């Protein structure tokens, strides 16, 4: 079935705990597979050692720019970008896992975890999973954000991978 993956996150080198995510390979197989492989690092690149670079309280926590660490970089396992797979899954509340983008058909590696319902993003960002465990960890990350998106501590995915 659907991959279960994890992200172990610290703040200025101090551990905050584990976020566990289900990836909806049953609905968005290509988008799910991208994220799964970037978690395991099996392609020779991925999320381990990269940051949450944009975190906005009462909105979302954004990560996945593992090349430039600021929203301008990242890439997929397929190439620099890939199409919007479908918009079947909606931004229904906190804990939704969704692709960041720069417009239609610009998915790379950047993603976000929602800390509120973000339904104004429906049909524009490809939702591909949700938090199974560690919404308290997400809330810790959210606490180091700001209204600008800048983080007040360096928030690092110290490890990541696939549980099943
Ligand atoms: C709530 C989520 O909000 C957003 O998605 C706001 N947008 C955003 O953060 N865009 C940066 C970005 C996001 C994703 C991919 C790129 C990209 C960069 C350079 N070359 C190719 C690319 N595919 C850039
Ligand atoms: K706002």
């Amino acid at each position: 079935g659907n991959p279960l993956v994890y992200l172990d996150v610290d703040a200025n080198g101090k551990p905050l705990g584990r976020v566990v995510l289900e990836l909806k390979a049953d609905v968005v197989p290509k988008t799910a597979e991208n994220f799964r492989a970037l978690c395991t690092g099996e392609k020779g690149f991925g999320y381990k050692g990269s940051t949450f670079h944009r975190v906005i309280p009462s909105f979302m926590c954004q990560a996945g720019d593992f090349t430039n660490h600021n929203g301008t970089g990242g890439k997929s396992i397929y190439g620099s970008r890939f199409p919007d797979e479908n918009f079947t899954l909606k931004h229904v509340g906190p804990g939704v896992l969704s692709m960041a983008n720069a417009g239609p058909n610009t998915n790379g590696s950047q993603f976000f975890i929602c800390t509120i319902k973000t339904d104004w993003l429906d049909g524009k960002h490809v939702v591909f999973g949700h938090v199974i465990e560690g919404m308290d960890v997400v809330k810790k990350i959210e606490s180091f954000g700001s209204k600008s998106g800048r983080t007040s501590k360096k928030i690092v995915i110290t490890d990541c991978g696939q549980l099943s």
Side-chain angles (χ1 to χ4, degrees):
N2 284 348
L4 249 196
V5 297
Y6 71 95
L7 313 176
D8 285 331
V9 185
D10 78 76
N12 287 339
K14 322 182 182 306
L16 310 183
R18 182 168 281 192
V19 185
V20 177
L21 305 154
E22 180 174 346
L23 311 184
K24 292 284 289 170
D26 63 334
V27 178
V28 278
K30 308 167 167 69
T31 307
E33 180 58 19
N34 180 60
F35 191 90
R36 186 195 67 72
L38 296 170
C39 289
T40 61
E42 66 197 65
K43 310 295 180 180
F45 51 88
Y47 297 134
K48 181 171 185 165
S50 64
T51 75
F52 285 76
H53 64 92
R54 183 157 94 106
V55 176
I56 298 170
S58 298
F59 177 21
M60 60 86 225
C61 307
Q62 186 174 333
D65 178 2
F66 59 82
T67 61
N68 296 343
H69 313 285
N70 67 10
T72 60
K75 65 184 165 171
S76 82
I77 69 169
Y78 309 115
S80 64
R81 49 178 59 179
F82 71 103
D84 299 314
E85 188 169 15
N86 60 58
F87 299 106
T88 300
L89 292 165
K90 310 302 186 181
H91 294 83
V92 293
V96 163
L97 178 69
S98 182
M99 283 309 282
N101 65 48
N105 309 300
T106 59
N107 305 286
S109 55
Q110 287 186 47
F111 66 92
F112 63 103
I113 309 168
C114 297
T115 57
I116 60 168
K117 180 165 178 250
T118 63
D119 61 295
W120 56 94
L121 300 178
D122 286 352
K124 294 157 173 71
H125 296 264
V126 172
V127 170
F128 65 98
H130 67 271
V131 180
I132 288 286
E133 184 193 305
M135 197 69 206
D136 62 316
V137 181
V138 178
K139 294 296 295 172
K140 296 181 197 179
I141 296 165
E142 180 182 29
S143 88
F144 298 121
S146 66
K147 208 163 167 185
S148 76
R150 291 216 183 158
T151 53
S152 63
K153 295 223 272 255
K154 195 189 167 160
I155 307 303
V156 176
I157 300 169
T158 55
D159 199 11
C160 50
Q162 183 174 8
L163 297 179
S164 65

